[model samples]
Each structure stands twice: as structure tokens, then as C-alpha cells.
Target chain A: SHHHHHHGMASMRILLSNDDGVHAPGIQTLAKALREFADVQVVAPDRNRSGASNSLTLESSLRTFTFDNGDIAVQMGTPTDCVYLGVNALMRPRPDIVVSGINAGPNLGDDVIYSGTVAAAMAGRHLGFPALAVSLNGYQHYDTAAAVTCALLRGLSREPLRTGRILNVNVPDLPLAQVKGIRVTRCGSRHPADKVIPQEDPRGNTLYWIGPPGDKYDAGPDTDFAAVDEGYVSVTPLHVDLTAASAHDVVSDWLDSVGVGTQW
Target chain B: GMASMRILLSNDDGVHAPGIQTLAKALREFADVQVVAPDRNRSGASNSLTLESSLRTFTFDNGDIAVQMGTPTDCVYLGVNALMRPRPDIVVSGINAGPNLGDDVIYSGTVAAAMAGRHLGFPALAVSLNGYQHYDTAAAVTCALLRGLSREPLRTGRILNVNVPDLPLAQVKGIRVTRCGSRHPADKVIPQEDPRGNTLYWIGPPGDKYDAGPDTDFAAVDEGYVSVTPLHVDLTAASAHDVVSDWLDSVGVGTQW
Candidate 1:
């Protein structure tokens, strides 16, 4: 029950990357699907780099290797590094757009702050390219998620994304026929609960392992979490501008009170 | 410039780094400080946490300070979650050796520490000195702001990223309330081959092109002013909401699916 639409926009450069690494089924499926619509170049982290966020490896260096098929170049770095390396050094002539993930799991709510998938897309946006991040809400049904992403990309190609904005799309783990639809949503709030769990080493010294994913608290309607929970594809527009506009006056007043020129 | 506040201090630089040492010492004059930082330099860590591995902690001979074996974000997370007693009055991250202006915050471990504090419901401040000089000026500026902010705490989820000019306090041209900028030169990734023929990549120097207007943090710092930009955790682009909604409606697949 897949709907196919050809926009006649062939050979458009689409940079495909993910946090799940080069060999993961998610990126493979996504790259294969996008190949139908564009010339896809796969540059991704060599291993599972989930929760890598926007980290860059400044202290050391990175290494790259081609997978057995030579279709993808794997970098020994974070997802953000892959995108930066690809756009600036690897890819011949920059890509028109960057798409990350079809991630193994949902990158919903505050989780995006720590998601390598979203970070890859953010790196593209930082480089002044239109970008999108897609994820499957569950582990299975990657093909279904890839189909949804292909359709969305086709639509986006017609009406390019606005400047400084990136779309984060999450698809429910279901067939396209069973999917309810799509919803434009907002980033929800999910607080980490009991994130630090105590453990012991061989000598029984105290240690800690970050616990499982946090529980969802702000899953109200119109939120990405809520939309995905209801079997709908959720599209959330994200931007890098983190200025709290309303708090400007408050901060300004404080700075004024501090007497800006005064020395301690 | 002293207040009797409890401060939770962290940094991207390792616990032994001079930046954090100077900052902690400066803050101690006015506030009771608890220092929890990474054991090693974690620059470019961003907001990452070590989810795949267990964490360890090392306490120094000094009391009330410990080094956590994790990223900057993990240090702040552990500080707010487990380390601090009576919860901190506020969280102050850095006195970083370099600036976190424009798009630099996206890759800054210093800013990530403050973000983790804000995420944990604490009023946070991220302070940096441009060009790695005049850290004393940054610390002094931080003290003055801390004294003022102690009287008027930052709202939850809202933190400040402060960049001080690397000039003497007298030559510094006051402070500017600025907005975050969108222009940071892209990172140059250089490919090299190791002795063993393994491909190696070195993240080269930052691009020198600065593209922000006068109202941005980059311009403020460039003009010898200490730039204080208010940042929030919510990344929603409200202006683009309607545009995306219209596109979704026009696509027609939303109704058909």
C-alpha cells in the first residue's frame, strides 16, 4: 500500500547518515530507498554512536574506512563528525541536503538533546544546508519508516525547508496502511527518572551505569511523543537558536544592576 | 564580590585544568563551592553522556571536590542528581579557556555543563574567556554577575552564556546583552595516513569567517564587550511551525494515510 510519486527531480544530491553506524539495517534501508529519488552518498559513524549528541573529537583524530560494498564510508567518530567530515572533506561538491537516521528507536522529546541522529541533522543545518532527521518509533518495520521518509523527502523537495529550520520526523512502528497519518508537533518534555543506577566492579568498588530511557511525562496531544503514540507520523521543526526571548529583559536588568563596567 | 551562596561548579576542562582551578578559587571567596568535573579534558563533548559504560569517581586530597570519570554533561548530571548537598543555590560552568560564541555552543563542553544544570532545574551560567587570555577578567566579570544574579535568580530552563573579552578589566568595554549568532566557520577535517597505513583524520583549526551582525555574541565580544547571551533548552522554531503545517496540509498524504 505504498504510494509512489516521481517528481522528475533526479540526481539531486542527498547525503545519508545515521547514528546506528554504516552496517545497521536502518541506514542501509534508508539509503537504498533514497537512491530511488536522488544520488545518495552514505557517510556514517563506523559503530553504534547513539546518544553522541553534537560531540566532536578535538583531542584525538578520526579514521575512515570503506565498508565491504564500498557504498558507505564509515568514520571512527560521532555522528556530527561524520556529517562535518563528509560535507567539508569527503563528498565531492557538497550535498544539496542531509538526512540522518531512520534511527533504531525514537528520538522524542528532550531525548533529542542527546541524540546523535538529530545531531547529524543539526550539523547540516550549522553548515547552512537543509536537513531532516527521521526515526522509527520502534525497532522493527524500518522499511515502512523508510517509505514514509522517501515520501516526505519528495514533498520537501518541492517546497524547500525554511532557513535555520530542520525537520525531525518520527514514524510509528506500523505498516503504511495501518499508519494513522501525520501530525506537525512540538518537542515534548520527558524527564529522566532514576537515570544513575548503582553497580559494582570486580573488586566490588561502587560504580554507576546510566539506566534505561526516561519515562514520558509531557506526552500531551500535539507533542511528538503523543502523535507517535497514536500511530501518526510526527514532524517537529527544530532550530539552533536557543535564545530565551522573554528572559532578555530580566537578564538585561540584572546586568544593568551589576553595573557592567564595575570591576570586582 | 562575595555572597554566601552554595555553588555547583563544573567544566569541560579536566579537574586539574587551570581554568577550573582559578574559577573554583575565585568563587570560594564569595560562595561555598562544590567542584565536580571530568577527570580529563572533554572539549567538544557537547551534550553527550556515557550511557554505554559505567562511571567512576575520584576524590582529591582536598575536601568537597571530586573528579568524575565522564563527560562534562555527565559531571553536571551527577552533581545535580547525587553529589551536591542541600542542592546547589546555582550552577556555574566554566571560565573556559576559549569562547562559546555563535554556533560554537553546539560543540562546547563548557556550555553543555550549564545546559545539564538548567535541564536539572538549576539556574545556570556558562562563562568563557576569548582567546585563552585574561581569565582573571572573566573570573572577575563572573563574580560581579554572580553577586547580581544571587539577588535575582535566573528563571528555570533559562541559562546565560557569557563571553568575556581577553583584555584587561579596565580596557574591556563594558557588557552587552546579545543574542546567539548563526555564523561559526565550519570545522576543517584533514585526512592523514598513520605509520601503519590506517586512515587518520585531524580536526583542523576553526574557520576564521565570522558572519554575525552587531547584535550577536560574536560582535559583542569582538568589540571588546563582555557578551551575555540568554539561552534556553527548547529548540522549537516557532516561526516555522505554520510553514511546516501548511506543507503537511498541501502534501495531501496526511488525509489519505
Candidate 2:
């Protein structure tokens, strides 16, 4: 028994964190499953950090506190903040991999823009670590078994799972054995058709509640949402390139005609 | 008679700000300058634009200027995508209050506005002074940038973020083409408690001194040279592009099926 446990203890060290508040059970379940193949350390937001993109809270002072479990450290900052602290300050020499999420909902299409889960994973990639941002399809019925399956697949593929990019994984809320398969996908487009819904407050004042994700998925083949809709796990690779280089030549010529060359 | 060429002037400091007014007046010497800018101060808004919401432009002046209720990127987008007198020959953004150097470009609405202009295939420039030492320096920096504009002119799809030292333009030691540098160490955040007892945060004070390396924007500005950095919209993780491509392949055909 002791010998078998010793073998289990030699698992790789994996840093597991998320944008979900430190108390979230999602992270707890993820950490427990990942512990089977790796030594898990959880670092996450002190509070719920939804809609926090690749923004760093540089202008704000940061506070870090250890949780009761001691395995987790909660940072009073964005998901990006937690990952930065985890890699640069808290973890020794850093873990081999950074995995963010098992997020509460899907980070699909343009949803990636406002997702703390995806941003946290992007932060890890920015800091030179291979990372994964994951989401279960919805709040319907989470498949813990499916979650473990995806985690293992990600772990087994980690050795060559790209660099300088994050793998965005979305699994349908289906049983592990029932899952169709995994698909390498692209970000699908979503337009929240009914965004702002008005409501009456206690004082008879009107307030607005932003409605849920509109089912505006562009029905294209090889898209993240479409893949998930067909009961397949979707994996999308994302990069940081924001430059539009295609229009450079035309504009440069115009600059030449305008005499900017002679003024310098 | 119509001016020799049309100049599109903008700034992130709002439409009625002193900088744009001074810039418009000075550019009027060389070309018919028009001001189209944001309705409010949009300091760190970066390259965001309003796509879903209906864009509205308010013409408070019968003159050649209009204020759009949007981001700096939005103003430039509206100008290029919609307005401007015969399509501006050049797009000039800012004589901003502070220097936008290093990694701060990621958050600078001023720079982003210029990038939007460049993204739209125009020769664009974003000019800022190190400090608002003298509000009057707008004319000086505006002339300096215009003079620089007359000479090199911005290349297509490329935006120049020009930072003038707080010294007089005469005392300013020429111009230097530099690369964006690592941020100064003094950049920090201040934490505060809001009136509702919520934890509030603000990006902290700006400091001038930096451990600048050769050929860096920080080093050029430190030596009193006007630092011009060529910026683009591509934020791709260059180093990892190939690595990820290989990984995607290795996960292979059968793995997903």
C-alpha cells in the first residue's frame, strides 16, 4: 500500500487555477481529478472574476492571502492577476503547466473576449507557460466523468500542445462514455439578440438585467459551438496577434504621397 | 480656395479639449484641418469600437469638427468609415497630457485611435508630450509632429507614437526611431475602498525615470530625443505560433475522433 502510494506521489506538478472564486466547487473537483496524474496546486481569484479579459490590474494594489487548504492562494485581483502571481511569485520555479477553468459556462466565439477563464489561460501563455481554458457546455448537468476524461486527454497531449497559445476546451454536459468525440474547432460567432431586459425596482425605478447568451451561433462546420452541439468536445487554439498587416502597403504609399518622408 | 490638403485631427482627451483646438489652429497653416474626436475623455480604452450600438455624431460647431459619443478608436473609425473632407490625407491623434511608453500602449486610447486610422489604410500618427508642463506646448509639439509629418510621413498600416520631452521643441534633441521598451518599475496600482465599501483600484502614478536599454523608447526619451515607435494591431504570440501549430497536428486525426 505504501509503495503504491509512493508511486502516486511522483506525479507531475500541475498548477491548477481559475477565474472562479476560490471557494468554487468546480475548481475543487478539477484539482481532485488532476491530482491522480499530477501534484495539484490551486491559485484562483479571491472573488468571482467574470468578464475580466486580458486586463492586468496594474493600476490597482494587489493583495494575496492563503486559503485554509494551504494548497490554494486567493488573490484579490483579476484572473490575469492570479496567474501572474502564481507563476512569478508563489510557485517555485513554476509548474510545468497552467490550467485555468472548468469555468461555469461556455467561452465560445466572441464570449472569449469577456471571459476571465480564457483570459487567465491567455495570461499563462503570455507568461510563457502552456495553458488550457476550459468550460462545460452549460449549467444543465455537469459530467464529472467527462471532465476527468478531457483533463487526461489534455495532460497526455501536453508534451506537444503548442506554445504561446491557449487551448480553449468546451465539453458538452454529457456522460463521459456517451461523449461522441473531440474536435479541433474555430471560434463561433454569437450576437446576444436580447441583451438588456428592463425590470422595476422596489422604489418603482426601472433597472436593466443583462439577459443570458443568445443562441446566435453561426451554423458553420468546424466551429466550436457547432461541434459541442453535436456532442463533441471542442478545442480551439488562440493567439495574441491583433495586428492587421494586410492593409499596410496601401496606407504606406499614401503617406509617401503626403510628404511625410521629407519632413523627418 | 480649398487648402493644399486636408488633415484629420483627433485626441483622446475629449472633443473640446485644449490640445485638439491648438492642433487644429496650427495645422490650419498647412492644410484645412478638421477635428473629429470622442465626446468624453477616453484615456485607456485601447482599440475597442462600438459595433452593436448605433453610433451618433453631434456637431456642436458649424465648423469642420464633430464629436462622436464613442471611444478614440470609435472616433477614428467614424472619421475613416464615415466622415472627413474627401478622406483625410493624414490622421493625427493627440498632443496628450502624458507620455504613452512601453507596455502602456496596450491601454492607450490615443495610440489605439492612431492604430485605427492606420488600420483603415491611412498614414497615422499619435503625438504626446511627456507632461502637461505648459498647455501652450501644444502648438510647439503640433508643429514638430507636422514638420516630422511633412518629412517622413507615416507608412501604411503603421502608426507612430511620438513622445516629446517636456523641453522646448528647440531644446528637444531631434528624433529617434525606437522600439517599445519594458515598462518603468515605478508603475503601480493604488487600492482603495469605495463609498459602498467595495474594494476599488486605480492604475497608479506615472514616473519618468527608467532603466532604459539602447534603441528603446525609454532610452530615447531619457536623452531628450523625440521617441517614435511604429505600432501595429497584431498582438499575435509570435514565438508560439509554430509550436501550437505542431501540437494541433500531433493531437492528430484519430485523437479527436
Candidate 3:
């Protein structure tokens, strides 16, 4: 009826998108459920944009299409594009917050650098909105994340951020009944990847398959990796600011004892 | 030498470059050395992995192994995991023909080889000369570092970007620990038309102009000193300070090399 239908609450605009395509069940089910509490405007990529970290489609002009169910999808657009349009040009009256994903896999630790899910959330913050990137550790039971994602939003409605913040949340793949508690965690150092495998092609060509990622080098109890492995939801606050001006003096005399400049 | 060790020696200059060849001979005096290097020049090959096809190796008569159609990372990974026996105590990459200065380290296969080793629990060293004219001196400098490495603590691994000036060992000023300088990107994407008039774009080298001043690796090498830059994996802005005496201690290898 186009009238607000959020459960026992005033309507607020939630511009939702993900690394997964607009048609993916994770986004679809999450949208169907959240529409009950908020005016969920779903705009997402036409296909999976996994591992596409913060890459905008600069080379080509972006195009979009609409689904039968009033959902919109971008053709060859990144997760960043969906939010860009939704917040700036696509949605009327603007959005209060941007939420990304229910991504199919873990964007924990080193995964943050390459995940499109995390990228879209950061993109939201970059464009001046509070964002949360929610990823599920296991592929199944995305619904478990719905309640957790809602709980965070529920608090933010009353306690909206005055400044930009991006929360990278990883929900364990469990039934809502089986999930453990959630924890505030930090990202850990991951073991660098090895295991490049070799194969012989049918045509006498030797080939190699890029190896899988290395296991955790330092998944301490304080790390997101440990929290997820222990069946707890991991919430790591990420920052976009990247400067080390404080380190100017640290390298100032690192070589003082070794004695240079005087010798030359 | 508690480190009567097997050193996995590799280079981006290919198996036959004087840099790796001379360094291999120099290294044999103190430690057992093995060379698994590329059959041809793979200079710009950074941390790229060989995918889709398998790797094949051809052994030279002198015990130097040539990785057929592989990048520097491939050579080091294969050497560390599959080729070497009892596992090499360390990975020493390069004695590069030219300096891998500033942003060049971002895409240097020489750095890639050492990073591969560092990731695999081995402390790694990447040695380079400002020019090939002083290759032997750089090799000797690396040898002296190797001598210290035979002791208990220094054998542990992390990436050391060693660049020697183009001078004799005695003429060279003392070694300086310096931070990396930034370089502007390649000057041009040379656009050209092919024989059939299809457009092609080529990438030019890093422009001569750099954002470097005193206190950088570029400055150290320019002033006739050896420059050693410690490349760390941590990008955390908060913990970005390091004034440790033994720079190796700052590397956080944490495990045996």
C-alpha cells in the first residue's frame, strides 16, 4: 500500500546493498524481513562482486535494470556504485544509514583488503554515512545474521553516530538458536599464502593454479578469527584514515649508532 | 657455525646474471648455497604467482637449478617447499644488477622472492647494487651479513632491502638504515599503433624525478653508503614506530627461519 509498515516503529530509510548480486537469496531474504521494520531500498550488483575492494567502474559508464519485485540492480556495477547512486542520486530524501551484505563468506582478517562487502561499507562511510558490513562465516543460515544486523541498527536508530564509523561484522553460520555471543574484536595478522600447485595440460603445456590462502599466523583470542572459530560473532571496527606522521621520529635515529653521513 | 646452513639463493636477474652467479660462489665459502633461479630475466615480476600451468625445473650441471618459465616468487616458493633439502636456513635474493629504489620495491621480483621466504618462516635478505659495476662489493657486503647471520640471533628472518653504491668495498661509506622514498609513476603509457594499426599502450619506466630527499634509501646510496631498508608487513598506522637497535628485532619473525 506504499504506507509505512515497520513493526511498531516510525519508518526510516535503509539503503541496502551487497557483494552478492541483487537476486542472491541472502540479500533477498534479508530485504524481505527488514521491510517489516524499515523502508529497505535494495540496490545491488547484477552479479557477484566478491574480492572487488573499493574498485569503482571508472573505465565504463554504469547502467542499471529493475527486477520484477521493485528491487533494482546495476549492470556491471560494483557494490560501491550501488551505494553511490542510492545515497546521492537514486533514493529520494537520502538514507539515514547504509548497510552492506550478509556476504556469503568470511571477510575476516586479511579478507578485508579484498572483499567487495567491506568495500561497499567503507564506500558508504567515505560518502558521509554510518555503514556496517555484515558477512556470514559459513554460506548457509544467512538468517542468523538478520537478527544480529537488526540489533546493531536498532541501537543506532536512537544512538546515531555524530562522526563516520564503519563496522565490519562477521556472523557465524548457525541457526539463530545455536549462535554464541558477539564480541568486539581486532583483525589479526594472517599467514602469507603459499602452495602454488602445478598441473600438466593435455597439450604438453605445464600450468599452475594459484594456491589457497594461508591459515592464520596470529589468530589470538582478541582477534576476529578466534571469535568466529569459537562460534561468536566478531565485530571489528575498521578505519580509513592511513597516515603515520607519529612515526617521523621513530626512524629519525634508527641508524644513529651504525653511523652514516659522517663516514661519507 | 650453529648455522652450518643451507642458503636458498635466488635472483630476478636470471640464473646466469653475474650478480647471482658471483654471490653464489661467494656464499659457498661460509654456508652451503643452492640457486633456483629463472632461466631468463624476470625483473619486473613482483609477488605474482604462476597460475593455470605447472612449473618445470631444469638442473644445470653445477647444481644451480633453473626454473623454466617461472617468476621470482615461484622460484623461491618452489625452492623453499619442494626443491631444497633439509630446508634452507635462509633465503638470500638478488645482488640485483640495478638498485630497486623507492617505489621500485613495490614491484621488484627480488623483493617478491624475499617476501615469499619471509612468509614461509625463513628470514630473508634481498641484496642489490646501485649498478652492476659494484656487484662483487654488494656480494661481499651480503657475505659479511651472512657471517653475522651464522650466530644465534641474526639467522632469524624478515625482509632487508640492501642497496650498495657503485664503488669498491673500502671506498663505500658505512651502511645506513633508511626509510623508503616515494616515486612518481611511470612517465608515459606509450600508445602506439601496431602493424595492422591496432592501438597498443606500453608502460615506461619510473621517471628520473622522485619525491626523495635526505634520509631516504636514495640519499644513502647517492652518498656512497650502503642502504638497508627494513620492509615490514604491518600496515597498522598506530604501531608504525621502530627505533630498535638490531633492526632485525623489529621484523617480528617470531618463528625459526
How would you order the candidates by DockQ, starting with the best? 1, 2, 3
Better of 1 and 3 by TM-score: 1
Better of 1 and 2 by DockQ: 1
Ranking by TM-score: 1, 2, 3
Best by TM-score: 1
- Clashing residue pairs, backbone N/CA/C < 3 A, model 1: none
Once model 3 is optimally superposed onto the true structure by TM-score, how far is the C-alpha of residue B72 displaced, in angstroms?
1.4
Per-residue lDDT of candidate 2, residues B1-257 (tens digit) = 33366677788788777777777777788777777888876444554444334455666654644445576755775565456645677778887888878766655767866765653333587887788764455466556556645555454445777777877656776566666775332324455776766554454554454536887778888898777676654333345545654565564522552
Candidate 2 is graded, for docking, as incorrect
TM-score attained by model 3: 0.59
CA lDDT, every model vs. true structure: 0.80, 0.63, 0.70
After superposing candidate 2 on the true structure, give the runs of residues whose Cα lies further than 4 Å from its correct spot: A1-10, A71-75, A126-129, A141-162, A177-179, A186-231, A258-264, B1-257
Please give the range of 10 consecutive residues that has the lowest summed lDDT in model 2 chain A.
A1-10
Give the per-residue lDDT of model 3 (tens digit) for B1-257: 34376889998878999999889988898788999989897534555555435678888989998888777877887887777866677789988888877856745778767866775334588898888697789988887666544433332226677888989888987777677776642333334565766543333345564657897888999999887777754322222112111221222211122
TM-score for model 1? 0.91
Model 1, span B99-119: residue lDDT tens: 898866767889888877775
lDDT of 2 by residue, A1-264 (tens): 464312454255566777776776667677766766566778788877564454455535566667667665445566766776666556775676678878877888756755778766765664334577878887644554336434544544445453445677887877777677666677777543334344565766543333455576575887887988998877777754333345445544544455332344
